[PDB]
Design a protein around this ligand. Structure first.
Ligand SMILES: O=C(NCCOc1ccccc1)c1nc([C@@H]2CCCN2C(=O)CSc2ccccc2Cl)[nH]c(=O)c1O
Ligand SMILES: [Mn+2]
Ligand SMILES: [Mn+2]
Length: 180
């Protein structure tokens, strides 16, 4: 069974993002052909993480999202055993070598604070920085420290709203928004 959402994802995101999202879902035992909204969300979260890491200087961020579970944890352990930073209970998305902290990036279709509360209490790791992006152009980071300059963040917000328009143009946005 082939959904309209599945074919939209493959034409909307670059193949390296799609392949990484596919491997991500399969590693956790879900199939992109059925759980299509989830497939779209993982591609989106991946692209945002990559744009985010592109916003700093050359080698400011270590990218943890997009790796297999074991090597991701391997890099985290290396980062911790070299900077003394506390070991997060859950896999973060990046490490900021400049600010010496892990970051978990969130992309939500809800209000940015409704999702922030859940992502905070769920991680409970007081050390891991949180940066939420919404599909409506709103953002929220811990301690109002948005890490990057405004221009890098604005590019992420533009892209998120483009994805929203393209889904809505294809009548997939409603099913997507009511699926989170
Ligand atoms: O790394 C993460 N999970 C580890 C990997 O998880 C799966 C779980 C099922 C399938 C594939 C990966 C992670 N997960 C969440 C949410 C809440 C915890 C589980 N989860 C979700 O399954 C929402 S779909 C999601 C999943 C990954 C990344 C981005 C998205 Cl949006 N949000 C994040 O920002 C995030 O980085
Ligand atoms: Mn992650
Ligand atoms: Mn994340």
């Amino acid at each position: 069974r082939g959904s309209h959402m599945e074919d939209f994802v493959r034409q909307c995101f670059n193949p390296m993002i799609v392949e990484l999202a596919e491997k991500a879902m399969k590693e956790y035992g879900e199939d992109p052909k059925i759980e299509t909204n989830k497939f779209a969300a993982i591609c989106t979260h991946l692209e945002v993480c990559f744009m985010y890491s592109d916003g700093g200087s050359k080698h400011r961020f270590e990218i943890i999202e997009g790796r297999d579970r074991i090597m991701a944890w391997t890099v985290v352990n290396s980062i911790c055993n070299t900077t003394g930073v506390e070991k997060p209970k859950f896999l973060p998305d990046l490490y900021d070598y400049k600010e010496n902290r892990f970051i978990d990036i969130g992309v939500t279709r809800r209000e940015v604070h409704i999702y922030y509360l859940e992502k905070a209490n769920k991680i409970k790791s007081e050390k891991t920085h949180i940066h939420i992006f919404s599909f409506t152009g709103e953002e929220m980071a811990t301690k109002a420290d948005y890490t990057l300059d405004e221009e890098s963040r604005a590019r992420i917000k533009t892209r998120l709203f483009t994805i929203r328009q393209e889904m809505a143009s294809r009548s997939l946005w409603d099913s997507f928004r009511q699926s989170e």
